[PDB]
């Protein structure tokens, strides 16, 4: 008979009296004798590998004063991997019956992350707290993703036309074109049609947050312009109303050419009025903010010859 | 001098590509470097495959958010007025406004009653109606779009709005001439050496020299008749 040592993950050294003819089952039953651990929960590691139950200490060439390493594993448990956006991978021991609630508690125990801040995603779908891993068909060595609720850091808020308020994570160096791209990443709105407004000031891309002195927890307003086919109304003094097809990039010269095609009036005899102003031929419809379903008034110069 | 990484907690030697220890779930120490020499076996290549598919499916999830979110923004161009989705407080009224009973201004994003905006439009002395919002930082310089103004006013008031707009431009030009028929809306711009303006509304011929209508007379006959009828 000989003595060997078993070292636990808690840091305890256990001594056992064993024989070379003892199987790994026998060694696990001795550990159950002393520590009360179920033998089919025990894993014994020697020479850096796991010992199989059917073999003996002699088969693995375990001698006197050899040190075995004990790891506890649920008999019906499995390992899964939760991937963060930071690139860190957490390895959890779970059971197929474990609920998403339990998995969050396991992530808290290991990584100190509160379940408040835990959103788990498997195969593109966010997992609900009452359902189990088997419900989502999460199997051995499956891979899940963990998205944390916040970073703290610096945040700003963007309210939109749909009533949805957006939360963004930026740094004072951030170009407004950058913040427009981060809005584009979360909402899909192309940056060229975004107008970010802080305190009534239109923000221009070149300047950054610190240069507009916009600190954290600010709330901005996102107004959207659009380049696309629109319809405007040109109204004569007689009440005659024609409907035009235009783009915001169209010139006033372009509009007068369209009126000439539809009503035969030459542009040199055309004077267009919008928002109490006469429209200059050089400027565009965007320049006057002439948007959809606007009414332009048409006054003709006096004929003579 | 083994290929794998030994677990500092349980001494199990794990395959290089595994992030956690196969026995005790401990994370692979960050100091360890995976040799490019290592070829993952069937278990590890399967796990890496599932990881790349998890990443693949997560990325297409975020693209569905992007496209799904964007279409709701484009959804709101289907109508002229944008309404409140949450309860709102009118900065002019102080009234509480249930969802769908307040208007969100498109150029400003400030939310108001239909009633106060109606008075703000009817009281605007400028052809461009400002948003009435004022706080201690700024007055808002955004303008109500005519789309929003037409949907906010009765057709009578909307027509009064357009009439004020064209008359604002008319008052601005000193080269304008208005039809002398009472209540007539016709008016024109002075062209050089043109002395008669046939109004397209009343069809009466306005003499631009006398700035009056004397169709049954000439300018001298009208002028002497004018002084004769108006004596002291
Ligand atoms: Zn280990
Ligand atoms: Zn109000
Ligand atoms: Zn405003
Ligand atoms: Zn007239
Ligand atoms: Zn005359």
From Swiss-Prot, chain A:
Keywords: ADP-ribosylation, Cytoplasm, Isopeptide bond, Membrane, Mitochondrion, Mitochondrion outer membrane, Nucleus, Phosphoprotein, Repeat, Ubl conjugation. Signal peptide: none annotated. GO terms for cellular component: cytoplasm; cytosol; endocytic vesicle membrane; endoplasmic reticulum membrane; endosome membrane; extracellular exosome; extracellular space; mitochondrial outer membrane. The keyword DNA repair does not apply. One of its GO terms (biological process) is modification-dependent protein catabolic process. GO terms for molecular function: protein tag activity; RNA binding; ubiquitin protein ligase binding. Residues 2-77, 78-153, 154-229, 230-305 form the Ubiquitin-like domain. Ubiquitin is encoded by 4 different genes. UBA52 and RPS27A genes code for a single copy of ubiquitin fused to the ribosomal proteins eL40 and eS31, respectively. UBB and UBC genes code for a polyubiquitin precursor with exact head to tail repeats, the number of repeats differ between species and strains. For the sake of clarity sequence features are annotated only for the first chain, and are not repeated for each of the following chains. Belongs to the ubiquitin family. This is Polyubiquitin-C. It comes from Homo sapiens (Human). The gene is UBC. The chain holds residues 77 to 380 of 685 of the full protein.
From Swiss-Prot, chain B:
The modification Phosphotyrosine is found at residue 138. Belongs to the RBR family. Zn(2+) 2 binds at residues 108, 110, 131, 140. It comes from Homo sapiens. Auto-ubiquitinated. Auto-ubiquitination leads to degradation by the proteasome. Phosphorylated. In vitro, phosphorylation inhibits auto-ubiquitination activity. Residues 41-69 form a coiled coil. It is linked to Polyglucosan body myopathy 1 with or without immunodeficiency: A disease characterized by polyglucosan storage myopathy associated with early-onset progressive muscle weakness and progressive dilated cardiomyopathy, which may necessitate cardiac transplant in severe cases. Some patients present with severe immunodeficiency, invasive bacterial infections and chronic autoinflammation. Component of the LUBAC complex (linear ubiquitin chain assembly complex) which consists of SHARPIN, RBCK1 and RNF31. LUBAC has a MW of approximately 600 kDa suggesting a heteromultimeric assembly of its subunits. Interacts with beta-I-type (PRKCB1) and zeta-type protein kinase C (PRKCZ). Interacts with UBE2L3. Interacts with PRKCH. Associates with the TNF-R1 signaling complex (TNF-RSC) in a stimulation-dependent manner. Interacts with EYA1, TAB2, TAB3, MAP3K7 TRAF6 and RIPK1. Interacts with IRF3. (Microbial infection) Interacts with hepatitis B virus/HBV protein HBx; this interaction is required to activate transcription of the viral genome. A zinc finger (RanBP2-type) spans 3-30. Residues 86-232 are annotated as: TRIAD supradomain. This is RanBP-type and C3HC4-type zinc finger-containing protein 1. A zinc finger (RING-type) spans 90-140. Zn(2+) 1 binds at residues 90, 93, 113, 116. Induction: By viral transfection. The lineage of its organism: Eukaryota, Metazoa, Chordata, Craniata, Vertebrata. A zinc finger (IBR-type) spans 159-219. Zn(2+) 3 binds at residues 179, 184, 199, 202. Changing residue 93 to S: Binds to IREB2 in iron-treated cells. Reversed iron-induced down-regulation of IREB2. No ubiquitination of heme-loaded IREB2. E3 ubiquitin-protein ligase, which accepts ubiquitin from specific E2 ubiquitin-conjugating enzymes, such as UBE2L3/UBCM4, and then transfers it to substrates. Functions as an E3 ligase for oxidized IREB2 and both heme and oxygen are necessary for IREB2 ubiquitination. Promotes ubiquitination of TAB2 and IRF3 and their degradation by the proteasome. Component of the LUBAC complex which conjugates linear ('Met-1'-linked) polyubiquitin chains to substrates and plays a key role in NF-kappa-B activation and regulation of inflammation.
